[PDB]
Write an enzyme that holds these catalytic residues in place. Sequence first.
Site, PDB file in Angstrom:
ATOM      1  N   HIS A  68      -1.550   4.094 -12.764  1.00 28.29           N
ATOM      2  CA  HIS A  68      -0.883   5.426 -12.725  1.00 28.29           C
ATOM      3  C   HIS A  68      -0.977   6.095 -14.106  1.00 28.29           C
ATOM      4  O   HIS A  68       0.074   6.443 -14.702  1.00 28.29           O
ATOM      5  CB  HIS A  68       0.550   5.302 -12.199  1.00 28.29           C
ATOM      6  N   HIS A  72      -6.369   8.451 -13.542  1.00 29.11           N
ATOM      7  CA  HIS A  72      -5.960   8.720 -12.137  1.00 29.11           C
ATOM      8  C   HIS A  72      -5.703  10.217 -11.941  1.00 29.11           C
ATOM      9  O   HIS A  72      -6.177  10.775 -10.928  1.00 29.11           O
ATOM     10  CB  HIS A  72      -4.736   7.883 -11.777  1.00 29.11           C
ATOM     11  N   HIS A 106       0.541  15.335 -11.199  1.00 30.89           N
ATOM     12  CA  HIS A 106       1.256  14.801 -10.004  1.00 30.89           C
ATOM     13  C   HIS A 106       1.912  13.442 -10.290  1.00 30.89           C
ATOM     14  O   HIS A 106       2.834  13.113  -9.541  1.00 30.89           O
ATOM     15  CB  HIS A 106       0.342  14.735  -8.763  1.00 30.89           C
ATOM     16  N   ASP A 107       1.447  12.666 -11.278  1.00 34.35           N
ATOM     17  CA  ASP A 107       2.048  11.350 -11.645  1.00 34.35           C
ATOM     18  C   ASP A 107       2.490  11.342 -13.118  1.00 34.35           C
ATOM     19  O   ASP A 107       2.503  10.254 -13.723  1.00 34.35           O
ATOM     20  CB  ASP A 107       1.091  10.186 -11.377  1.00 34.35           C
ATOM     21  N   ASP A 217      -4.884  11.847  -3.644  1.00 33.64           N
ATOM     22  CA  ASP A 217      -4.110  10.743  -4.269  1.00 33.64           C
ATOM     23  C   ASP A 217      -4.710   9.381  -3.881  1.00 33.64           C
ATOM     24  O   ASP A 217      -4.712   8.477  -4.738  1.00 33.64           O
ATOM     25  CB  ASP A 217      -2.635  10.856  -3.899  1.00 33.64           C
ATOM     26  N   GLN A 269      -5.501  -4.878   2.550  1.00 34.08           N
ATOM     27  CA  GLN A 269      -6.361  -3.671   2.415  1.00 34.08           C
ATOM     28  C   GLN A 269      -6.736  -3.136   3.808  1.00 34.08           C
ATOM     29  O   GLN A 269      -6.639  -1.902   4.003  1.00 34.08           O
ATOM     30  CB  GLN A 269      -7.577  -3.990   1.545  1.00 34.08           C
TER      31      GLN A 269
HETATM   32  C1  IFY Z   1      -0.291   0.607  -1.368  1.00 34.68           C
HETATM   33  C2  IFY Z   1      -1.753   0.774  -1.685  1.00 34.68           C
HETATM   34  N1  IFY Z   1      -2.218   1.965  -2.046  1.00 34.68           N
HETATM   35  C3  IFY Z   1      -3.565   2.084  -2.330  1.00 34.68           C
HETATM   36  C4  IFY Z   1      -4.106   3.342  -2.705  1.00 34.68           C
HETATM   37  C5  IFY Z   1      -5.443   3.454  -2.995  1.00 34.68           C
HETATM   38  C6  IFY Z   1      -6.298   2.335  -2.905  1.00 34.68           C
HETATM   39  C7  IFY Z   1      -5.812   1.103  -2.555  1.00 34.68           C
HETATM   40  C8  IFY Z   1      -4.428   0.943  -2.241  1.00 34.68           C
HETATM   41  N2  IFY Z   1      -3.914  -0.307  -1.885  1.00 34.68           N
HETATM   42  C9  IFY Z   1      -2.621  -0.398  -1.606  1.00 34.68           C
HETATM   43  C10 IFY Z   1      -2.033  -1.725  -1.202  1.00 34.68           C
HETATM   44  C11 IFY Z   1      -2.242  -1.981   0.297  1.00 34.68           C
HETATM   45  C12 IFY Z   1      -1.563  -3.239   0.747  1.00 34.68           C
HETATM   46  N3  IFY Z   1      -1.810  -4.479   0.258  1.00 34.68           N
HETATM   47  C13 IFY Z   1      -0.971  -5.363   0.944  1.00 34.68           C
HETATM   48  C14 IFY Z   1      -0.926  -6.792   0.676  1.00 34.68           C
HETATM   49  C15 IFY Z   1      -1.751  -7.377  -0.292  1.00 34.68           C
HETATM   50  C16 IFY Z   1      -1.695  -8.743  -0.544  1.00 34.68           C
HETATM   51  C17 IFY Z   1      -0.809  -9.560   0.159  1.00 34.68           C
HETATM   52  C18 IFY Z   1       0.011  -8.983   1.126  1.00 34.68           C
HETATM   53  C19 IFY Z   1      -0.039  -7.617   1.377  1.00 34.68           C
HETATM   54  C20 IFY Z   1      -0.171  -4.630   1.857  1.00 34.68           C
HETATM   55  N4  IFY Z   1      -0.544  -3.295   1.732  1.00 34.68           N
HETATM   56  C21 IFY Z   1       0.022  -2.191   2.428  1.00 34.68           C
HETATM   57 MG    MG Z   2       2.742   9.262  -7.557  1.00 27.17          MG
HETATM   58 ZN    ZN Z   3      -1.072   9.444  -7.773  1.00 23.96          ZN
END
Ligand code: IFY
Ligand code: MG
Ligand code: ZN
Length: 313
Positions: A68, A72, A106-107, A217, A269
């Site tokens: 962040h 970004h 925005h951040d 974003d 992911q």
């Molecule tokens: C939030 C988020 N925002 C992103 C924005 C841009 C690119 C990649 C991004 N990845 C995530 C994390 C996604 C995610 N990982 C897990 C999980 C990872 C390990 C073990 C258990 C769970 C769960 N959830 C929802």
């Molecule tokens: Mg933000």
């Molecule tokens: Zn952002």
Amino acid sequence: GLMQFTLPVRLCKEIELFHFDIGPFENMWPGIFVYMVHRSCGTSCFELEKLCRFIMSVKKNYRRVPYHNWKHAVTVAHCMYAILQNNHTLFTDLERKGLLIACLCHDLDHRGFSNSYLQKFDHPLAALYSTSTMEQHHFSQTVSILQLEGHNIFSTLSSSEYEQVLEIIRKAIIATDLALYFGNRKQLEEMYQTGSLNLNNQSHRDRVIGLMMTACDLCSVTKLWPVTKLTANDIYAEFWAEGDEMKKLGIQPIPMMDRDKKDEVPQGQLGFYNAVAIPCYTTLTQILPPTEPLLKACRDNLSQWEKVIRGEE
Ligand SMILES: Cc1nc2ccccc2nc1CCc1nc(-c2ccccc2)cn1C
Ligand SMILES: [Mg+2]
Ligand SMILES: [Zn+2]
């Protein structure tokens, strides 16, 4: 006046593509942003002296966090630039001014922690802003910088045009709260399918802008796979640090924020792409057809994560 910004040939060509990476040379990023303002908005949109001084105050007020950060902010501004440039006639002069500035700001002053962690820590900002805690702070920081002497880039706007642009930037920045994205896309999905979506309706424009802000974003997922994969390391670096801080408060974090559960990242992911990313760029593609390349790149990266799980990389 006649001073244009000009990039090297490879950057001049690739900056126009959705999947453009702004590169590891921090000192070029202001110039990259001013270039985008001039082509997207016009050379007359902002006083170059005021703009350059605004950009460097914004940069200073981003922190040295893994994800962040200043990179970004500029990355999110570029995705908006590519959307606006592929949707020439659909947006007003005030909107193209405001949205590039909103993305850049925005951040602002992000600490690498979620709204949830601020709440459980009982951080002063959580008392001041009960919902969209950080996003209200990001807008507050944006107003503060605009009011520094010689920093007001909107000085030539009328009182009513100035109020209109700050209202675009407030809504735009508040919309980057992913908690609000689900309801906003569902409403846009309903409006599109029943054919009631109307871009002259100001409440409809606000929702479309909001979905554009989520698309920009999350644009890490729309890059070439090497960029997507390496950015994921920065994203999880922040989450795991937050997981550590949750444990210090005597709270077991969710698997996403627990570094002990690194092994589950590939599946995490897939869930995120299927739950958040793919739906977002699908609705955006429906409303703005020329943003299709974001959906395609997002789908290409979903396939890459499915390969990771199957032990093909
Ligand atoms: C939030 C988020 N925002 C992103 C924005 C841009 C690119 C990649 C991004 N990845 C995530 C994390 C996604 C995610 N990982 C897990 C999980 C990872 C390990 C073990 C258990 C769970 C769960 N959830 C929802
Ligand atoms: Mg933000
Ligand atoms: Zn952002």
